[PDB]
Design a protein around this ligand. Structure first.
Ligand code: HEC
Ligand code: HEC
Ligand code: HEC
Ligand code: HEC
Ligand code: HEC
Length: 142
């Protein structure tokens, strides 16, 4: 129900949440995860493109602003146990430069051992050769 408001304008397939987050409970309130739990709240000026809702892997907001939303639910201690490189990136690159949360599957969860090293090379190399590199908005892995 809460998400119905957003989906009055936004496309229910591509702008609908169809990844793992579609089926999980918000640990903070024990209710299903909703759009505002990640994006916050539209203002009356929403259609004009203003700093109302959070935007992930785009240049509007700083890495820290984007990533901190994730940490309203996730625990950095647990991210370390899942995959070591998390800690060094929490303040340094947008979480959604790697993860894709809206599609039916998140490509990070299915990478080969080889692929899970190639992402490091690809992005760190780009940082060395791309004068326009922006850690808030990285299209490379997409
Ligand atoms: C029309 C009445 C809207 C409803 C209701 C909601 N959204 Fe919206 N959204 C709308 C427009 C016309 C735009 C483009 C604005 C611009 O920047 O030019 C947006 C944008 C967003 C975004 C940013 C998309 C991106 O580029 O990353 C997000 C994340 C977003 N809207 C979310 C969102 C949520 C969570 C809503 C319900 C609480 C919601 N929108 C309602 C139009 C409309
Ligand atoms: C609560 C409102 C959440 C916020 C905000 C974010 N996440 Fe989340 N996430 C949440 C839950 C309850 C779960 C399930 C854990 C489990 O029991 O399995 C998850 C899961 C993920 C995953 C795994 C996805 C997959 O396809 O396997 C990822 C990669 C993930 N979360 C990342 C993530 C990011 C980057 C966030 C901010 C943009 C974020 N989550 C916010 C709950 C919540
Ligand atoms: C690429 C360098 C990544 C960045 C940037 C972020 N994450 Fe990540 N994450 C990445 C991989 C390759 C994996 C899978 C590890 C595996 O088991 O195969 C993950 C996993 C997660 C998970 C799920 C953990 C679990 O218990 O299964 C979560 C919840 C998650 N990642 C969240 C997350 C957040 C919040 C990030 C920004 C602070 C973030 N990730 C960045 C790769 C990468
Ligand atoms: C975290 C668990 C999220 C929830 C729940 C919702 N959104 Fe989302 N959104 C999130 C991320 C990490 C991204 C970047 C792209 C990706 O899939 O990882 C987005 C993106 C959007 C956008 C713009 C992206 C695009 O379609 O080009 C919009 C307009 C958007 N999100 C809206 C939206 C709606 C309506 C939601 C409820 C159905 C919703 N988001 C939930 C993180 C998360
Ligand atoms: C962009 C999508 C990135 C991906 C993929 C990976 N990293 Fe990265 N990392 C990124 C930035 C913008 C930075 C800061 C600038 C820099 O290059 O140093 C980093 C930093 C690191 C660090 C520094 C740790 C520290 O000194 O505090 C390490 C150790 C690191 N990155 C490792 C790493 C690994 C193992 C990755 C794949 C599993 C990886 N990075 C991917 C951005 C991105």
């Amino acid at each position: 129900n809460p998400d119905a408001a957003c989906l009055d304008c936004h496309k229910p397939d591509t702008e609908g949440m169809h990844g793992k987050h579609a089926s999980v409970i918000n640990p903070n309130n024990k209710l299903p995860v909703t759009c505002t739990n990640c994006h916050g709240q539209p203002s009356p000026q929403h259609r004009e493109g203003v700093k109302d809702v959070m935007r992930f892997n785009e240049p509007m907001y700083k890495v820290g602003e984007q990533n901190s939303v994730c940490m309203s639910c996730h625990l950095p201690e647990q991210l370390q146990k899942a995959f070591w490189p998390h800690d060094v990136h929490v303040t340094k690159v947008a979480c959604a430069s790697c993860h894709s949360l809206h599609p039916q599957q998140d490509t990070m969860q299915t990478l080969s051992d080889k692929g899970r090293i190639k992402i490091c090379v690809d992005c760190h190399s780009d940082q060395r050769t791309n004068p326009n590199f922006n850690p808030a908005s990285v299209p490379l892995l997409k």
